[PDB]
Amino acid sequence: DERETWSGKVDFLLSVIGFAVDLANVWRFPYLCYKNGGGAFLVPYGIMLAVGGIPLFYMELALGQHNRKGAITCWGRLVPLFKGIGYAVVLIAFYVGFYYNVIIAWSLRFFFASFTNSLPWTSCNNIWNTPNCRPFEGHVEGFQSAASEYFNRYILELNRSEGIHDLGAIKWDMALCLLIVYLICYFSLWKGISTSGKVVWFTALFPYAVLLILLIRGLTLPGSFLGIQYYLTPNFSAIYKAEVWVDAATQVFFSLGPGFGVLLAYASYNKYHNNVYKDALLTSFINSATSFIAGFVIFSVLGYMAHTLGVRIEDVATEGPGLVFVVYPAAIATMPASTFWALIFFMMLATLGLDSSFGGMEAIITALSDEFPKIKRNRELFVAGLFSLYFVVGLASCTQGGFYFLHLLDRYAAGYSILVAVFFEAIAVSWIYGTNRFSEDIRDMIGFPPGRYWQVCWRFVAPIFLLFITVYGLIGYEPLTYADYVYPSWANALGWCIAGSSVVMIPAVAIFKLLSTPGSLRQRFTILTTPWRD
Amino acid sequence: EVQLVESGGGLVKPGGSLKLSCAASGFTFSSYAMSWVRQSPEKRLEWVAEISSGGRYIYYSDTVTGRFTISRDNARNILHLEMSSLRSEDTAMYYCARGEVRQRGFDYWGQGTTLTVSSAKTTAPSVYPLAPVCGDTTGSSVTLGCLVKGYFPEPVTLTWNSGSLSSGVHTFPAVLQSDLYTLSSSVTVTSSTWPSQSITCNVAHPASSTKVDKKIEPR
Amino acid sequence: ENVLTQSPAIMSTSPGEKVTMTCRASSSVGSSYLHWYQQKSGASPKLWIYSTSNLASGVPARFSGSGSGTSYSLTISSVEAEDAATYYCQQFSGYPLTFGSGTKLEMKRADAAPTVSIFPPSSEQLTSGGASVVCFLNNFYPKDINVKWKIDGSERQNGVLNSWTDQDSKDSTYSMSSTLTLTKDEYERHNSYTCEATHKTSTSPIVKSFNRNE
Ligand SMILES: CC(C)CCC[C@@H](C)[C@H]1CC[C@H]2[C@@H]3CC=C4C[C@@H](OC(=O)CCC(=O)O)CC[C@]4(C)[C@H]3CC[C@]12C
Ligand SMILES: CC(C)CCC[C@@H](C)[C@H]1CC[C@H]2[C@@H]3CC=C4C[C@@H](O)CC[C@]4(C)[C@H]3CC[C@]12C
Ligand SMILES: OC[C@H]1O[C@H](O[C@H]2[C@H](O)[C@@H](O)[C@@H](O)O[C@@H]2CO)[C@H](O)[C@@H](O)[C@@H]1O
Ligand SMILES: OC[C@H]1O[C@H](O[C@H]2[C@H](O)[C@@H](O)[C@@H](O)O[C@@H]2CO)[C@H](O)[C@@H](O)[C@@H]1O
Ligand SMILES: COc1cccc([C@]2(O)CCCC[C@H]2CN(C)C)c1
Ligand SMILES: CCCCCCCCCC
Ligand SMILES: [Cl-]
Ligand code: NA
Ligand code: NA
């Protein structure tokens, strides 16, 4: 086969290490440790990682390398009745890009905003603050931090949106950042993985540089140890609570991202007899390693806020963009050489997102190249049209009420969509295709069959591991709300369409492939359950 | 425990077609890739074919490719090898070796089965007993002999006294010369044992329905 | 194809000594794929060392293995006679899979002159118009030995079938059989048949002979 292949082996490694390590390593794993019994949280985290995630992480990386094709084709050549999986997985990757790149633009607008000596978000006597302001985070909502009013009232101007319907003015300073993002994408992966494979060196290694700097300045700070205590001081009571084994199980899933079509796409250019098993374990480790490390960077600074700046930690130990955009920038502002910690930090946050946004694009570009060769013969040109659809719709997220539109996509674009999709991937591979077939495939590739441990995690554990999350994840349904803004019933119904528009293509192309073929039913499933390689 | 048994194979005329069989037992034959390794009569090992466990990955040596076919019956736990357009350099003993992990090699090996490809024709031996020269005999232990000359193909089974005396037996390997094998075995027994006790040569050649005893009587 | 050659081809060693054998690949081989097989005289081969150094179950710890790249070796610390075998290396990295030429480990012992014994043509064979004289040379060391036939006085060079045995398993010795064959007419037209075996144990060769009448 004249397929392409990674210019170097590190280009595949750093392309995967970068897709996996993003802001959720910096902002949701330290919170989960802090909230759920400290270091003791590492137990259910590691258990849910050992039996549920890395099993799944391994399974996809091996498939992608072996079946050598992108996400759509690789499920047609494996179980044709379930070719719809590849279609679902790809537009989910299409939907996410409608908001994921915005979070990078926020970083870039803060990076551009950190070119000064008095960082704007530190003082509360500016044109955008309110009389109900505090210089640092508190626990009353009418009174927000000076670094949180700079975010909601100047950077986002969310105070000028009465809801989802009131998008209000397009803010072009943010639009110009969203373009700088999609341009940073295009010229880094238009010509192929010949160049994307190299681009990821800066964007995947630079965070580790900024981490080591911020890990030193964080740890060499008055009150730095007090943070490390709140991070890891073990309370094994939380072990008992099953609400913690869901938070471990759900964080392991989205932090590694198996069954997303990316690792499959990235492996499809791997050389056949490459030891993917080694790559799976080495890659997965550097992931959870970076999150454990990153909690030290965050919570060293987070302890310094409590001891020096006089805040209750439960008021600064937050998750999500509030931490990287309000809380941590607020403590940077108090440190000497603050303009330096600002720039590396936001240039960290940006690079943390780019590698991961690269993977989403490629899973779409590769799945389409490997099926509609008009796309393949016209790569450079195709991507232009793709990223422009992103930018144009993305202008809806650069308005004043932009956040409300993002929050909807954060919840529905790829929420319950992907969880069922991967459940059908585990079922399609461990059961319909066959671990019998699958292990025989791997042995031909790397030289040995997967240990009976892996086979068992693939066939039973992972399906009930995914089931564990979707069940305990539907039990906690609440209508979409931000602050007091209750999203209207038609906005959820809309978000249900984009959540359905993925999963529906599983029984759709199951039905369409059934009806489009000749024979009798057991002759029907047999013809649609025997793979191409067979 | 784990054990393999190769079966089928024998004499074949050149261009002919023979099929071998390896019966696995003592382990999950479905889980393990097997491979066929052959050994020429010049004692050099050579790999022939490999088949994956499910049988969907099949690698051939460049020598036997297009002529051999290695199939696999995971129901009855039988590994197969179908030979066609048989050449003479295909002559060897064929081994059924269990290897799944390349990094571990061939775990277990069967007895092996013997393929002889030759246009030459089956003939039976004529066993001559070797009684010593009548003169002299002025020694302490006496050596007898037996001559199994002019047979084909291998093997031949030579025991002394129905397989009852082994100390003092030297059964020399066969040597082919102009499409015919010649074997001889020498037996050295104490002077008090022969011709006091009966020394017979028990030759056996199944390929030609031959069961011949030639007792050693003096000259 | 990845050609493997091993040295030496044959290796005589006294028990207790230390032996080393080498395996050299025409193309480079990853360390994790080169294995070693022990095969005894007339038995199926046995997996001995897998992935360069790891012994297989049942392999005494007196065996070691090392090497990398294009040169690997098998090393026996202190040999016993239960290790007289032929050893093969094998690569499993690429297809076709290839086995090395093998090294035949033979036991070294003190020298031993042969015991020649010559046998006239059988009586049953003479009726068949054939007449072959058998000369046995048994239990001697080292392996090399050189027979010579003399019908009457003249040495006869063509018509002979020699066959050596594998090294004996109790005394580590050798035996060999030479068979000069003749037509009945050419045998009944001479009387002296001599079989003299030259060996390193004596410059003067051990002789055996007989006359067709006595
Ligand atoms: C910095 C800290 C948070 C790192 C997180 C720990 C993980 C990187 C560790 C925790 C438990 C480890 C796992 C525990 C058990 C196993 C089973 C083990 O199974 C085998 O030995 C092979 C099975 C077979 O071949 O039969 C493979 C490694 C693995 C997945 C380990 C991989 C790495 C894990 C997930
Ligand atoms: C907290 C700070 C000190 C962590 C710093 C760790 C950095 C230096 C480590 C963590 C991840 C590591 C990378 C992970 C992957 C590989 C692929 C391998 O084939 C070459 C080394 C390379 C490229 C590593 C280089 C060094 C590396 C970037
Ligand atoms: O909040 C929107 C924004 O509107 C105004 O900015 C205009 C600007 O004046 C024009 O030059 C053009 O660039 O479009 C802008 C829209 O972002 C206000 O001046 C500004 O304060 C305000 O944020
Ligand atoms: O001192 C900071 C400086 O920046 C402000 O914002 C700029 C921004 O930095 C640019 O990225 C652009 O995109 O939008 C704004 C327009 O200048 C203001 O310029 C200024 O008030 C302030 O001093
Ligand atoms: C193509 O699918 C994706 C592309 C980019 C990002 C994601 C995410 O799901 C977005 C939500 C947070 C988890 C991310 C995955 N982990 C962090 C790698 C999915
Ligand atoms: C879901 C991706 C759709 C992208 C638009 C197609 C552009 C066609 C250019 C030939
Ligand atoms: Cl994580
Ligand atoms: Na990244
Ligand atoms: Na991660």
Residue numbers in the entry:
A (entry chain A): 25 to 161, 203 to 599
B (entry chain H): 1 to 219
C (entry chain L): 1 to 214
Sentences from the paper on this structure:
In this study, we employ dDAT as a surrogate of hNET to study the interaction of NE within the primary binding site. The dDAT primary binding site is identical to hNET in subsites A and C, whereas it differs by two residues in subsite B with polar substitutions; Asp, instead of Gly, at position 121 (149 in hNET) and Ser, instead of a Met, at position 426 (424 in hNET).
Tramadol inhibits the transport activity of dDAT with a Ki of 15.9 ± 1.8 µM, which is substantially higher than that of S-duloxetine and milnacipran, indicating weaker affinity. The structure of the tramadol–dDATNET complex reveals that the drug binds to the primary binding site with the tertiary amine of the dimethylamino group interacting with subsite A residues D46 and carbonyl oxygens of F43 and F319. The methoxyphenyl ring interacts with the sidechain of Y124 by aromatic edge-to-face interactions and fits into the hydrophobic pocket lined by the side-chains of A117, V120, A428, and F325 of subsite C. The position of methoxyphenyl group coincides very closely with the catechol group of NE and methoxy group overlaps well with the meta-OH of NE. Much like nisoxetine and reboxetine, the methoxy group of tramadol occupies the space between A117 and F325.
